[PDB]
Amino acid sequence: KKKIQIMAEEALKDALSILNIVKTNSPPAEEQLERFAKRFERNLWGIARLFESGDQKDEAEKAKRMIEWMKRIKTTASEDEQEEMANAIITILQSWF
């Protein structure tokens, strides 16, 4: 399951883009944030499936929760809550190289 590297790289770029949108804009570019969240969620659903196929359920639910965190970023009105989830998502994706 280890080779999921291009998917994690793309997911990291999307997460860092959202993080940049949240900080830069005071009222964020809501449609551009939705564009990156959709791509990110898609990438991590695949990462979760590859971990499931590789019998690595611990890293699979880890990937699943980061989808819920990205969905929270879409919902939440607090910029700091958006930052929190983005930094958490970023640090976990990095654990996967």
Numbering used by the authors: 3 to 99
Which of the paper's sentences describe this entry?
We first grafted 14 cytokine residues implicated in the hIL-4–hIL-4Rα interface onto Neo-2, while preserving Neo-2 residues implicated in the Neo-2–hγc interface. The resulting grafted hNeo-4 was then subjected to random mutagenesis and four rounds of selection using the yeast surface display platform to increase hIL-4Rα binding. Clones from the converged library were expressed in Escherichia coli, and the molecule with the highest binding affinity for hIL-4Rα was selected (hereafter hNeo-4). Overall, 16 mutations were introduced into Neo-2 to derive hNeo-4; 1 of the 14 originally grafted mutations was modified by selection, and 2 more mutations were introduced during selection. The molecular structure of hNeo-4 was determined via X-ray crystallography to a resolution of 2.97 Å and showed atomic agreement with the computationally predicted model. The topology of hNeo-4 in complex with the hIL-4 type I complex was predicted using AlphaFold2, which showed the same overall topology as the native type I hIL-4 cytokine–receptor complex. Similar to previous reports, Kd values for hIL-4 binding to hIL-4Rα and the hIL-4Rα–hγc complex were 0.48 nM and 64 nM, respectively. hNeo-4 had a 121-fold weaker binding affinity toward hIL-4Rα (Kd = 58 nM) than hIL-4 due to a higher rate of dissociation (koff) and a slightly lower rate of association (kon). Interestingly, hNeo-4 had comparable affinity (Kd = 80 nM) for the hIL-4Rα–hγc complex to hIL-4. We validated that the Neo-2-derived hNeo-4 did not exhibit residual interactions with hIL-2Rβ or the hIL-2Rβ–hγc complex, confirming that the specificity was fully transformed. BLI binding studies confirmed that hNeo-4 did not interact with the type II complex.
